[PDB]
Write a protein that binds this ligand. Structure first.
Ligand SMILES: C[C@H]1O[C@H](O[C@H]2[C@H](O)[C@@H](O)[C@@H](O[C@H]3[C@H](O)[C@@H](O)[C@@H](O)O[C@@H]3CO)O[C@@H]2CO)[C@H](O)[C@@H](O)[C@@H]1N[C@H]1C=C(CO)[C@@H](O)[C@H](O)[C@H]1O
Ligand SMILES: Nc1ncnc2c1ncn2[C@@H]1O[C@H](COP(=O)(O)OP(=O)(O)O)[C@@H](O)[C@H]1O
Ligand SMILES: OC[C@H]1O[C@H](O[C@H]2[C@H](O)[C@@H](O)[C@@H](O)O[C@@H]2CO)[C@H](O)[C@@H](O)[C@@H]1O
Length: 493
């Protein structure tokens, strides 16, 4: 009655996490495991992995030889249990030291790093005689699995599985010169054709995500609205034509969040616990965070605006910058937790931070910090996501789970999860926050103004909004069932 489902990905929360992809792999993984499926995950063994939620971590005695550049290479296989999921971590013994770089992403040879991993992952499956019903791969890094499976593993004895591919951001396609596709074992001449993996915008380049759209039996992305956006020329980023052709098997499914990990009632990272029925502990976290950061608590009813994000153009960094000053102008406080891989963006925020070193109302925390994010979601009254585009976004869901009311731009997943309380056309049950259309200060200001007005003018009306938003189901229940139905329908076919 239950499927055997393997997920191959570059991330899994909390052990190897950069953003939402890692969150999703774990969250969907666990939801599927509750539904009775044998779920297993295959990751790289990064040197920079987070050890502390890994149980029973051990190196197996079986070495697994894997192909790359015409030679076979040794891989140490590790197993462990990460939040009840079985995980296989691949440690390559290739002289280039692919997962020994101090970093998850951003090396000059990422293409080689993750195409190797993709090959070795399938090799691990073959060599253990595993016969999965579903192999689910994620983003460009493991897009290589789809053509690899069909070209080299279905005709070697591994022909049990259907392939599912999720793209969590179609911006990242993994494009490179065609020469580089041959490293993992794929036939360049066969696959560098317009009906296969040749890029949309060049002749001697290949496109991993395009290959995964073509070769997979199921293709998803992470919200219904984003799925529509990427079918248009302007949002598709070259791939719109391919997605329109293969539309029958392409569907957008709104991510959930892991509501066991993200739960104010049992969150171990918090000072005080709380829930929809008792917000006592929310005010206590607001006070604790102020005290930890050196923000003023002299006034009651000063709204704390939080923002937790990677600082990259996608997230509307000019609007985030503006929001700091506007929040302050409007008589609120602001806490930013974020860092940028882009130095000019890091430098711009570093300047703002110094400006507010020990200010009573503004603190900027320019770093990745898990513990702190928990207390920021808990403490904050308002949470901003003014994204230029957003495939899904999880932070707005986590914020609402912790009672913080979102202010979001109407785009991609935010359009499917955030609904303005002042728009009459929206049914009352969905209304949970504040939105704006245009990506400029004027648009953002009107949403922020209304949110500050609502917070200040009627405390008990506001408290109902918090209660209501905290009672919304953000779990994977609903969306895990949609993935399950795609899996079963493909297996039967
Ligand atoms: C958070 C984000 O993580 C992943 O994105 C990473 C890329 O996959 C990496 O390759 C790397 O991007 C570099 C490019 O490859 C390189 O060519 C150059 O353009 O520089 C880039 C930046 O160094 O780094 C990216 C992260 O910085 C993942 O693929 C992406 O999907 C993730 N974000 C989405 C995930 C979810 C979860 O479903 C959605 O909710 C969010 O809306 C997405 O934003
Ligand atoms: N600076 C940071 N410190 C701690 N957690 C962060 C930071 N930036 C982002 N996160 C976390 O990463 C995840 C972001 O996922 P998502 O909203 O899908 O955006 P993206 O995938 O583009 O980063 C959330 O769990 C969020 O709390
Ligand atoms: O090999 C070329 C071919 O690969 C994929 O074909 C799969 C197909 O998707 C599965 O349903 C099943 O029939 O196995 C096939 C492997 O040969 C792509 O789907 C197809 O478009 C591509 O050209």
């Amino acid at each position: 009655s239950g499927l055997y489902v393997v997920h191959i990905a570059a991330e899994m929360a909390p052990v190897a996490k950069v953003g939402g992809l890692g969150d999703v792999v774990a969250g969907l993984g666990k939801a599927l495991q509750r539904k009775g499926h044998l779920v297993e995950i295959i990751l790289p063994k990064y040197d920079c992995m987070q050890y502390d939620r890994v149980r029973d971590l051990r190196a197996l005695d079986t070495v697994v030889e894997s192909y790359f550049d015409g030679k076979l290479y040794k891989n140490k296989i590790w197993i462990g249990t990460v939040e009840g999921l079985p995980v296989h971590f691949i440690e390559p013994q290739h002289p280039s030291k692919f997962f020994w770089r101090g970093q998850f992403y951003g090396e000059q040879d990422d293409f080689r790093r993750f195409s190797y991993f993709s090959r070795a992952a399938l090799e691990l499956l073959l060599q253990s005689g595993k016969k999965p019903d579903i192999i689910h791969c994620h983003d460009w890094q493991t897009a290589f699995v789809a053509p690899l499976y069909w070209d080299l593993y279905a005709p070697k004895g591994l022909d049990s599985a259907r392939i599912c591919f999720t793209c969590h951001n179609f911006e990242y396609q993994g494009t490179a010169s065609a020469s580089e596709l041959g490293s993992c074992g794929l036939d360049v001449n066969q696959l560098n054709r317009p009906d296969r993996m040749q890029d949309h915008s060049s002749g001697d380049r290949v496109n991993p995500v395009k290959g995964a759209i073509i070769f997979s039996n199921i293709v998803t992305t992470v919200s219904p609205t984003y799925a529509q956006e990427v079918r248009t020329a302007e949002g598709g980023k070259g791939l719109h034509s391919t997605l329109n052709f293969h539309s029958k098997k392409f569907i957008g499914i709104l991510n959930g969040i892991d509501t066991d990990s993200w739960n104010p009632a049992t969150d171990p990272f918090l000072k005080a616990q709380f829930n929809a029925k008792d917000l006592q502990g929310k005010e206590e976290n607001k006070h604790a965070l102020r005290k930890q950061l050196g923000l003023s608590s002299a006034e009651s009813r000063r709204p704390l605006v939080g923002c937790i994000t990677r600082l990259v153009p996608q997230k509307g960094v000019h609007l985030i910058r503006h929001a700091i000053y506007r929040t302050l102008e409007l008589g609120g406080q602001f806490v930013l937790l974020g860092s940028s891989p882009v130095p000019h963006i890091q430098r711009e925020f570093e300047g703002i931070e110094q400006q507010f070193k020990s200010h009573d109302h503004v603190r900027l925390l320019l770093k990745y910090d898990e513990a702190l994010s928990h207390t920021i979601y808990a403490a904050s009254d308002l949470f901003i996501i003014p994204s230029i585009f957003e495939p899904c976004g999880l932070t707005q869901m986590i914020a609402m789970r912790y009672g913080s009311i979102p202010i979001a731009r109407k785009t991609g997943g935010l359009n499917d999860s955030v609904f303005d309380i002042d728009d009459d056309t929206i049914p009352t049950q969905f209304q949970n926050g504040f939105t704006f259309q245009t990506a400029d200060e004027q648009g953002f200001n009107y949403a922020l103004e209304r949110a500050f007005n609502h917070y200040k003018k009627d405390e008990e009306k506001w408290m109902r909004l918090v209660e209501k938003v905290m009672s919304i189901d953000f779990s994977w229940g609903s969306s895990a069932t949609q993935y399950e139905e795609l899996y079963t329908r493909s297996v039967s076919r």
